[PDB]
Design a protein around this ligand. Structure first.
Ligand SMILES: O=C(O)[C@H]1O[C@@H](Oc2cc3ccccc3oc2=O)[C@H](O)[C@@H](O)[C@@H]1O
Ligand SMILES: O=C(O)[C@H]1O[C@@H](Oc2cc3ccccc3oc2=O)[C@H](O)[C@@H](O)[C@@H]1O
Lengths: 627, 620
């Protein structure tokens, strides 16, 4: 179950396989088997990592439906593979992939936003190796994220009662129809790499938890004592593992040698005196170095069999009444939902962009975001660990309704996504909360609200069982009839998406604020902490008015000014994450002006009027103690 | 019923009352009547003509609901009023007005897009006169154009099932909710003027018709003989009227003296040898000069006209016996600052753009336009489909006799005002009403519209074709559109349905074209298009890009070219225009092939090239 990010050290090496690959589009329902067994005929170039859709303007790959096939060759010195365990890792292949090496299927995966890997020790050979990866972009009623098997995309226009329209639909070209509001970018969206570990015995997983903090300082920078726990899992086959705790300067401040017991694990606790805590706006990271010792322990030899360096931060998270406590201090979220989205790359990971976006989060005086609507690339979490930005980590369970709740295949994929996200991400101190879905159907009459609850409650429990830190769990709720939804109010933090004054009461900020206050009165009675995870207004940079109407920069600024003045009056409202950080691509349609334009930044990360207004507001709101 | 545009001549003078007036906003359902008795307190400035909504950025007058009050003073020499009939004309007050002069209520008008006038001979006095005009902008289920009494504006987003939304609606500020897709600009949108006629007897109305053309030239520039008819109505009280026909150079080419009979009318026919005909792309105008006789002239009026016939014949639309093809668009009277206010600089520019595009026609979507625009199109050879403000209609309106009454007023009023223009070739009695469905609904719509079709025919002395512009609907259960003289359809295949899929859009369009092929009427587009933000570009153009709009017209027009019975392409729209705000309107309607500032998008260039190669006559 461990998926530690590949590391290079004295016992391990990583060989990236990124670069310009060969590529062919394939069929709507299948691809040629022979393409895995020999070089692709007449290949196109395709950079990896990246979405494929915007990498070829001769083709219309945004319209592609079905399979594509990637391929490349590689060779490595025999000297480096000898005696080692060889693993091929795919950080993400969106949505489903079949991976072949030298004409043999290594295996398959479903789930477009989480990593998977194969043991290729026996499949590799000397000299050039031929790696082929078939990737399927199709979405439908059984995928996460969810597609529509017929009709229109989410937020699509129709005239379904016109006989000519009904007839033309029957014969129209097959297309993915997202039941979600972001473009279905597909392909090898994240890195590919070959890596090595020792074969006889190796470190397979590490979990670090902050179990307890004693006498936390007034400023939350330190605690008199921190109790941390480690759990190390091994693969392979009186053995021991040395655990060293390094502080921010790399000095060993704690260390223990633990017995490995059988499935093989070592676990224990370590007390850290005068512990330096991790906080939003004030990151501090330690490293847990795990070193597998040879048979005979340190008593017999100085050599190290295997090693892995796991970053971690010491901090607690606790929901208490209507507060969200980090290191016992009442936190207030400032930020937004994001997307992994950019020109050229699509959903492809881009660390230049991640580094820039983290600086923009600081420029705005924001302190947090949500990984709307899928787990992000691993590097972004490491960056937010070092930069003191809090994350709500969310699985790709977007577009769901009652059709999905009855389907065992969907429930299995949903559990896989929750387990996989938490297994990948559990050691990040920046992650303070898990989201098990975005905007599923929860309300209505008859049995529908109960059916939704019965689907989601076990997933809430799974997210708690899976996280060794036991962080809060939420479900991000779409604008709905909050009085018949019986699921959202059971979450640990209530996370609501609301578009009062945009999708309803349009343009009337007085009415919008009145409606918002009626719903806030409902949440006030429930007595849980509540935050916005979405609210906003599509905004075309450069459209201006003295009395700003919808789509103007002024309306977007006025929107936030009015709504935020209302939530400031509620002590139990513990965060404001708006929609969205930046404009992003969507399926085309009559309400999407070259995608979603609710960004406070443009797609090129330039600030609209509302961004300047929010920057000034957020400059004056502290991370702790605002409420 | 005559509403001849005010003229100055030896017998008549016009005194314009345009300029910067005083202005105050008033209440949702009332205004202070006493404001007519003294200068408005603390007035704002307000230019007339113009909509008021965009003339004050300290206020949000786009949000205004109810009444406003205009006022100004004027004085004219006693010498000018002596012995004359004094008439105060409002070219348009949108939507309803109460008019006072020196504190006396002259009367009221309902209907925001047609002229009305008052005899103020007795209310005028020497020196300064105080003119107060209260204007009501309210629209609702009994007005034309139609407003919604509750819910949202047309094409508005909602979450009606959210309890907080339902409750907030109950208490929200009252607003007009258009059931139409253009902003509800209000105020004194067109000119105001005082004018004079003789009092004892005067010319009240003139109708000129083209009755028959003999031996029309191959190129339709002339006919060996044209038989025209005149009908002159008089007001006041063996009298006679002199009718002189002036050609384009002002030469009197024909003349007759007719007896006036009592209701007081003179009528007759005149034969014009080697008549110069009016054609799209080749205007020629005559003037009929009517002079009431006692060397003296008692009264006079100069009525421009053009000699031409219009005939629907099978699946053809014949102008002077030639098969015409419409190229053009729906327009709007819409611009920055002015709103719906008439602007003849803009009208002159727009007519030049119609020529730049090689278009030949437009429709007055969705209300009669200012009179000056029709005069301009008369002289510039641009054909017009003239439409009343019956937009936003459905079964709630058809059951309401007040709406039918207003609809009849609008049809009679438009045709009475506009009947003499040669550029007008067809009348439209509605845009996008509800016509389809189950049960009694299609028959109820037909029973409502058929008498209005008959009224438009009865009212027009030229007996021009009459249509009803149909919104995308279930054409198989609509039983009304197919009975019109020309079938005029608004279709948005590939935009509002089959979105972005031009192959599917063309397949669907062709299925509906197969339906119309069997009906056997002439058919044309009056709307089709795609919102387009200038500057948004793609190599594979998606919705809102300039390329998608160009590709849209390229694909759709290739299909209608294959149908010989499809006699015109009027797209939506000439230029981007203002609407009520909402999630599908990016600062208004962006289906213009031109921007709101009349700059050409990619599609405008593509259409210009297409239209350059399509002749006015004989394309099909
Ligand atoms: O609409 C967006 O910009 C985002 O919408 C979110 O889901 C919601 C959509 C609607 C639509 C109509 C009325 C109320 C709504 O409230 C919502 O909460 C979605 O989570 C985002 O991914 C979309 O981008
Ligand atoms: O939508 C417009 O741009 C114009 O719409 C016209 O009416 C129609 C609206 C719709 C909506 C959805 C599907 C099909 C439609 O077909 C129509 O004909 C209206 O005549 C114009 O005034 C609008 O601006």
């Amino acid at each position: 179950n461990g998926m530690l990010y590949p590391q290079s050290n004295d016992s391990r090496i990583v060989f990236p396989l990124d670069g310009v690959w060969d590529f062919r589009t394939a069929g709507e329902d299948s691809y040629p088997a022979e393409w895995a067994d020999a070089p692709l005929p007449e290949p196109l170039p395709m950079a990896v990592p990246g979405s494929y859709n915007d990498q070829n303007d001769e083709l219309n790959l945004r319209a592609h439906y079905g399979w594509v096939v990637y391929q490349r060759s590689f060779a490595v010195p025999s000297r480096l593979v000898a005696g080692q365990r060889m693993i091929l890792r795919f950080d993400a292949a969106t949505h489903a992939a079949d991976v072949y090496l030298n004409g043999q299927l290594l295996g398959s995966h479903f789930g477009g936003f989480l990593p998977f890997e194969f043991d290729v020790t026996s499949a590799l050979h000397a000299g050039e190796n031929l790696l082929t990866v078939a990737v399927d972009n199709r979405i439908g009623s059984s995928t996460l994220p969810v597609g529509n098997d017929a009709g229109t995309a989410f937020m699509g226009s129709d005239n379904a009662n016109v006989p000519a329209v009904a007839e033309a639909k029957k014969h129209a070209r097959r297309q993915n129809l997202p039941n979600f509001d972001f473009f279905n970018f597909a392909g090898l969206n994240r890195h590919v790499e070959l890596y090595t570990t020792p074969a006889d015995a190796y470190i397979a997983d590490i979990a670090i938890t902050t179990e307890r903090l004693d006498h936390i300082a007034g400023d939350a920078c330190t605690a008199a004592n921190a109790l941390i726990a480690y759990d190390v899992t091994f693969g392979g086959d009186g053995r021991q593992v040395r655990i060293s705790i390094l502080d921010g300067e790399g000095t060993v401040v704690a260390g223990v040698t633990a017995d490995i017991e059988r499935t093989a694990k070592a676990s224990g606790e370590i007390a850290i005196r005068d512990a330096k805590l991790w906080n939003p706006g004030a990151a501090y990271l330690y490293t847990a170095v795990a070193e597998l010792l040879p048979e005979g322990g340190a008593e017999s030899s100085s050599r190290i069999i295997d090693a892995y360096r796991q970053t971690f931060g010491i901090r607690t998270v606790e929901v208490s009444g209507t507060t969200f406590l980090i290191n016992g201090k009442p936190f207030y979220f400032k930020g937004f939902g994001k997307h992994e989205d950019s020109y050229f790359h699509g959903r492809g990971t881009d660390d230049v962009l991640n580094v820039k976006d983290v600086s923009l989060i600081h420029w705005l005086h924001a302190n947090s975001f949500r990984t709307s609507h899928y787990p992000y690339a691993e590097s972004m979490y490491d960056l937010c660990d070092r930069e003191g930005i809090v994350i709500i980590d969310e699985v790709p369970a977007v577009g769901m309704s009652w059709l999905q709740y009855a389907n065992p295949l969907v429930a299995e994929r949903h559990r896989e996504a929750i387990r996989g996200m938490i297994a990948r991400d559990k050691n990040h101190p920046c992650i303070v909360m898990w989201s098990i879905a975005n905007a599923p159907g929860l309300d209505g009459d008859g049995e529908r609200p109960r059916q939704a609850y019965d689907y989601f409650r076990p997933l809430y429990e799974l997210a708690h069982a899976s996280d060794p830190q036991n962080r809060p769990v939420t479900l991000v709720c779409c604008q709905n009839d909050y009085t018949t939804d019986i699921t959202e109010r059971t979450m640990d933090v209530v996370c609501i998406n609301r578009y009062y004054g945009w999708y309803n009461l349009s343009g009337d900020l007085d009415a919008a604020c009145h409606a918002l206050n009626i719903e806030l009165d409902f949440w006030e009675n429930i007595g849980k902490p509540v935050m916005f995870t979405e609210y906003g207004a599509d905004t075309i940079e450069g459209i201006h008015g003295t009395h700003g109407e919808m789509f103007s920069e002024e309306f977007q600024r006025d929107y936030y000014a009015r709504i935020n003045a209302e939530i400031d009056k509620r002590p139990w409202f513990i965060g404001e994450q708006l929609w969205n950080f930046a404009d992003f691509a969507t399926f085309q349609g009559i309400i999407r002006v070259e995608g979603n334009r609710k960004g406070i930044l443009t797609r090129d990360r330039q600030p609209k009027m509302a961004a300047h207004w929010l920057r000034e507001r957020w400059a004056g709101i502290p991370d702790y103690g605002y409420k």
